Design a protein around this ligand. Structure first.
Ligand SMILES: CC(C)(COP(=O)(O)OP(=O)(O)OC[C@H]1O[C@@H](n2cnc3c(N)ncnc32)[C@H](O)[C@@H]1OP(=O)(O)O)[C@@H](O)C(=O)NCCC(=O)NCCS
Ligand SMILES: [Ca+2]
Length: 157
């Protein structure tokens, strides 16, 4: 079984190794630290036997909505990064990480929408997001360094 709690500074090293094992977008140590410092309340880790086995890293923004059609300014939650170690997948961890972060984005940061980018090839991630009622808003052509497209996926809070 797993539990969830807010990320702390001491977790960063484990988070980074998870990032590097599971994702190609490998952010530097200081990048993790700044997100923890500025958006900590919405930054969670999943824990098994006092080891970190997954995390979600958020960013809180203010700007044009990508749900509304003509220009409207809103507070937005952005999922910068989420990952769960291979051995611990299909247990609801990502789902609960997203729920916790969304609730914080709404209650702590007054966000009224959450969005993210996902590789169009990333079948498991897209499945998860759609189950949580994210909608594909647009395709960000060539969004990744290799040229791969991303879906921008979003939902209101
Ligand atoms: C995507 C990822 C975070 C999901 O983690 P997870 O803890 O296994 O997700 P959950 O257990 O909460 O699954 C939630 C639901 O999403 C869907 N889903 C998750 N993984 C799936 C997969 N491998 N194939 C099909 N559907 C999947 C399922 O509907 C699942 O519900 P179910 O188990 O009852 O069928 C995980 O696979 C991962 O760390 N991938 C690599 C990193 C990554 O791609 N991050 C996302 C970049 S935007
Ligand atoms: Ca992806």
């Amino acid at each position: 079984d797993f539990t969830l709690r807010n990320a702390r500074m001491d977790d960063i090293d484990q988070i980074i190794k998870i990032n590097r094992l599971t994702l190609p977008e490998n952010y530097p140590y200081y990048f993790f630290v700044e997100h923890l410092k500025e958006y900590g309340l919405a930054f969670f880790v999943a824990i098994v036997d006092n080891s970190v086995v997954g995390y979600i890293m958020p960013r809180i923004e203010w700007g044009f909505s990508n749900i509304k059609q003509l220009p409207s300014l809103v507070r937005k939650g952005h999922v910068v990064s989420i990952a769960v170690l291979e051995e611990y997948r299909r247990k609801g961890i990502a789902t609960t990480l997203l729920e916790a972060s969304m609730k914080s984005m709404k209650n702590d940061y007054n966000a009224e929408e959450i969005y993210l980018e996902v590789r169009v090839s990333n079948y498991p991630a897209i499945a998860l997001y759609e189950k949580l009622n994210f909608k594909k808003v647009k395709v960000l052509k060539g969004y990744y360094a290799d040229g791969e497209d991303a879906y921008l996926m979003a939902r209101p809070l």
